Amino acid sequence: CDELAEIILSRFSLIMQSKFSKIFLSDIQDETINQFINKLYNGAPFIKTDKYIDPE
Amino acid sequence: LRNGESDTKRNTQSQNEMNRTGLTKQYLIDNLQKLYSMRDTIFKTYDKECFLHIW
DSSP, X not given: OHHXXXXXXXXXXXXXXXXXXOOOOSXXXXXXXXXXXXXXHSOOSOOOOOTTSOOO | OOOOOOOOOOOOOOOOOOXXXXXXXXXXXXXXXXXXXXXXXXXXXXXXXXXXXXX
């Protein structure tokens, strides 16, 4: 039970840690992000921006 | 019978002083490009170490 308790510590620490998110890098109050996220989260097959925010 | 004698002593002391000043001003277009981020990079180190980076 001592060896099983150590595994559950490792197995549960992996479930809590393993959380995925997508990060947008831009200026701290650049409103183009809010319009971008709103379009992306909803349906948006085509989004139009300019070169100063490259998704790569 | 004629005999002659002659002496002479000279002593010259000189002093010089020369002051030179120059200012060569060179105009390179490259030094103009490096002007851009000179003031801006002052507030890129302020931003990273004093302000909140999450919205």
